[PDB]
Amino acid sequence: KPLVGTGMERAVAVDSGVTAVAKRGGVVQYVDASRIVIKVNEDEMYPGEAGIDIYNLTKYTRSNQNTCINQMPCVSLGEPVERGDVLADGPSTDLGELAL
Amino acid sequence: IQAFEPVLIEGKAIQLHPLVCAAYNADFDGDQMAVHVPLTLEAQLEARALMMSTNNILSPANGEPIIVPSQDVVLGLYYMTRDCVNAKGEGMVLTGPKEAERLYR
Amino acid sequence: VTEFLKPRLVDIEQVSSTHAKVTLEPLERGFGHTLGNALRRILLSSMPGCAVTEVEIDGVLHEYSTKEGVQEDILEILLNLKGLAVRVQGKDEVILTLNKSGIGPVTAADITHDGDVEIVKPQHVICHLTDENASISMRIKVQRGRGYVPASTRIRPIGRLLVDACYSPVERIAYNVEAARVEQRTDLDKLVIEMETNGTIDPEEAIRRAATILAEQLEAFVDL
Amino acid sequence: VTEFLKPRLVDIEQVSSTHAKVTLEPLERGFGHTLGNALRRILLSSMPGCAVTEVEIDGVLHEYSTKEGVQEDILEILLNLKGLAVRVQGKDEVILTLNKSGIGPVTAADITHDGDVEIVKPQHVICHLTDENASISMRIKVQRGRGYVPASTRRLLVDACYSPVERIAYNVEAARVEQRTDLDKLVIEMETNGTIDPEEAIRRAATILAEQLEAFV
Amino acid sequence: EIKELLKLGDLPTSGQIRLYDGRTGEQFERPVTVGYMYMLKLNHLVDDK
Amino acid sequence: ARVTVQDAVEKIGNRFDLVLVAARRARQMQVGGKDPLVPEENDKTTVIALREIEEGLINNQILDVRERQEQQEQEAAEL
RNA sequence: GGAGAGGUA
Ligand SMILES: [Mg+2]
């Protein structure tokens, strides 16, 4: 992280597509370097077709400039999460804020 | 463009004697340079006797030198040849510059 | 006159587990800076370390892959392992082994240590297993070296992973000079050396090592 | 892991006897700065040596005066005396007389021999005389010492310059023993006042420094 | 406010502190400015050129 | 080592023909089976020829004299 | 090999 930001960091980070941002708050049911699964919050859940949220992570893949890109989880088991919060740090990011 | 003698280095960047930078108007902000080698003997002699850096010291446009200590050495020298009104070890007498150096050291 | 008081090691204040202090006294005028700078350079320069060199994990082929069950990349594991701290008594090279199963963190304590290899930071974390039926086994290689050695410049199967070597215990060295309280004399100096190592070295041993190193190096100039 | 490049060769360049340029190589990376610096400080900071201490003039009791029949001024002759170079044996401090008259450059040979005390530079001028009928007599007290005390620290008095060296410098530079070209090479230029050869001064300084840390082996 | 925040720490409010040379070991006169800066490594690698 | 050419130019105050005469001498030396006139110090032929020029024992005129003399010797060596 | 786009000093 940059010690002295201008506060516009989280906006840029989340608005970009690199990081995996939760869509409906929930709880980490199981984490792995490759994927994540969230038991959805009771209320956010739709009446029919409950299911549970799941994410897969793009591992090392060449960028347009020959720079590898991959994502790393930034949470542990049993961690409650909220809608729109970051889950997987992408390149040059730290806890869902830009860090070059 | 100027000739030089080479000195090998375990790097991947062409070192350059700083004084000539003014002549090349070359900043170190990522400017690149190109290297050529003279093959035949006459080329080598031309280089040594005409294009060696030590032979080009006055701009052809005018007799003014072209190896002016550019920006940093000048600061050092100016700072050196100053004088505080009352500094440590004032008013004494010395028997030559060597004593001055020893005293300062 | 024409004689100089020989300094002696007076005290070693082990102010913390790693932070330590040493005192040298007496010292003739002007020598404090000389010796302090010299010893600082020597200590920061060369000291025998025992950093880890190679790794061999069971079910992986290259550091850029992942392993199921573990929630960190192989590169992260290697990076964390690089900062390990340990001492070895007799041998110049040893092979440690780590096996672990179940869920939770993996401290350094989880190593099947022998009586000659001694960890200094048992609680050093490595990785977090996130599945009960997910285990990891690995063989670690520890060598005895000095200074820095990148993996690029050294000198076999496809399972060996190579890290960079940083054989150096010390991290920060400072010192001060100050007047002593000798029976009757002024301008008599006393040196205090503050050090902070990673904890795998005896300060006194380090000082004696540096001093003998310096003396042995200096002895060339005499009797040219 | 306890082996280090001891320098070889130890070569020398001999400019005029009171000036030498020793070249030592190849030393382990970084040791050049530490070795050269320490020796420098030891040489030019602490060194046994006796130098003139004070003076008294027969006809002058104050520095802000002038004698006649002498070409120069009090301060000039004082500087000359500061530039003096003598060596003495077990006799710690000595006093010497410089009575002399007649026009001429009064150089160092004009002082009484006083036995063991030895003047290293007889040619060293001290003053000059302008009237042949003029005279000059003076008593100079020399005393032993180590460092360098200015006048302010304390019947005329002069600063003491015990150290015999005059100039030292060095410039570490790269070298290679057939590989591992990240190695250094020390080049010490030294110029003494002549009271001893540079090569011997280096040995003295090395002796002092190496001996100081004896208690750590 | 920067001054006040600094004074919250025990750092000199002037911002400039004294330093000491690596080789010689002696102090630098003229207290010097030091701190922390965020820096990037750009995509113009020497090996590429 | 060679750092300047000022003395050679003093011996030959044109700075162009200097190159040609030095080149001819060094060509005699390198491919031609000739020997130097100054003790070399593990230095290349060009600098050696330049130093010869510097000491003045070799200039264009002396070179012409020597080439003509050796030509006459060769013309006298056929018989 | 030639076009077009972008980029550095
Ligand atoms: Mg530029």
Curated annotation (Swiss-Prot), chain F:
Q: Keywords of this protein's UniProt record, alphabetized?
A: DNA-directed RNA polymerase, Nucleotidyltransferase, Transcription, Transferase
UniProt-listed Pfam families: RNA_pol_Rpb6
* Top-level enzyme category: transferase
One Gene Ontology cellular component term attached to this UniProt record is: RNA polymerase complex
Has the keyword Transferase been applied to this entry?
yes
Name the source's superkingdom. Bacteria
- ATP-binding keyword on record: no
Q: Which Gene3D superfamilies match?
A: 3.90.940.10
Q: Which SMART domains match?
A: RNA_pol_Rpb6
For this chain's UniProt record, which GO biological process terms are given?
A: bacterial-type flagellum assembly; bacterial-type flagellum-dependent cell motility; cell motility; cellular response to cell envelope stress; DNA-templated transcription initiation; intracellular iron ion homeostasis; nitrate assimilation; protein-containing complex assembly
Q: Which SUPFAM superfamilies match?
A: RPB6/omega subunit-like
Q: Which InterPro entries match?
A: DNA-dir_RNA_pol_omega, Pol_omega/Rpo6/RPB6, RPB6/omega-like_sf
Which GO molecular function terms does the record list?
bacterial-type RNA polymerase core enzyme binding; DNA binding; DNA-directed RNA polymerase activity
EC number(s) on record?
2.7.7.6
Q: Give the reactions, separated by semicolons, that this protein catalyses.
A: RNA(n) + a ribonucleoside 5'-triphosphate = RNA(n+1) + diphosphate
The annotated subunit structure for this chain is: The RNAP catalytic core consists of 2 alpha, 1 beta, 1 beta' and 1 omega subunit. When a sigma factor is associated with the core the holoenzyme is formed, which can initiate transcription. The rRNA transcription and antitermination complex (rrnTAC) consists of RNAP, NusA, NusB, NusE (rpsJ), NusG, SubB, ribosomal protein S4, DNA and precursor rRNA; S4 is more flexible than other subunits.
As for family, the record states:
Belongs to the RNA polymerase subunit omega family.
Q: Which NCBIfam families match?
A: rpoZ (TIGR00690)
Q: Its biological function? A: Promotes RNA polymerase (RNAP) assembly. Latches the N- and C-terminal regions of the beta' subunit thereby facilitating its interaction with the beta and alpha subunits. Part of the processive rRNA transcription and antitermination complex (rrnTAC). The complex forms an RNA-chaperone ring around the RNA exit tunnel of RNAP. It supports rapid transcription and antitermination of rRNA operons, cotranscriptional rRNA folding, and annealing of distal rRNA regions to allow correct ribosome biogenesis.
Protein name per UniProt: DNA-directed RNA polymerase subunit omega
Source organism per UniProt: Escherichia coli (strain K12)
At the highest ranks, the source species' classification is: Bacteria, Pseudomonadati, Pseudomonadota, Gammaproteobacteria, Enterobacterales
Could you tell me the gene encoding this protein?
A: rpoZ
